[PDB]
Amino acid sequence: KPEPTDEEWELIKTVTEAHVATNAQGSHWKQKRKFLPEDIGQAPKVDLEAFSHFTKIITPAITRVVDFAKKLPMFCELPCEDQIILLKGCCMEIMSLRAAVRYDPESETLTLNGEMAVTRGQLKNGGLGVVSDAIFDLGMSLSSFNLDDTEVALLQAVLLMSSDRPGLACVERIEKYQDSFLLAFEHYINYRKHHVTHFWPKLLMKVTDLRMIGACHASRFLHMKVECPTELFPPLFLEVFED
């Protein structure tokens, strides 16, 4: 079917250079993967020993997400007030995506930050709750798509550039940015020509799956702020999810 244009290709080459220089351990991850001890998160609510081990790294994770959007020109052509709104809304969305795409079905464990390998349970009891299943259920699903950096990358942009976040200023400009990526993404998809029936439409559904994850994550954030010590919440963590 239809494919990219010398210009859109160039767009891709960008997004990618971004996601790749901002994705932990690159494709040399499985060798830094250090499985979390079996004992952290067990037989009960929350589980602070875990909640901690998680926020102990959640900081440098968000920064990456920030560093990723910074390498996107269409991003820097926005106001510093919106550049934030975006980060705040898509931060979780881009993070959890990045993790699902790293779900090893054999071991049945995600790999956060490219260093820590967690389990459905662990992640759940850890604070995300129902979101774990959701983030894992995603991973499993995606194992079929075999998304390459580019794809993950593009998918990550489509999220970043959500024109619907509230408080946004330069709406219209953004929407087209998103429109500008979506097209390219699809095209790039055609060149890829995956062996997966009725495709893209499906891939699009994943975007929703990721927005749901983020929308829920916020809810979970509040409980986390009630069932957990404000002594365990790194700033940026709060800076991002806090209203």
Binding site: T63, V66, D67, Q83, I84, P235, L236, E239
Partner: peptide, 12 residues
């Protein structure tokens, strides 16, 4: 605000 701003400003 705060930090984010900090991250959006670093050349580096």
């Amino acid at each position: 605000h705060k930090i984010l701003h900090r991250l959006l400003q670093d050349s580096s």
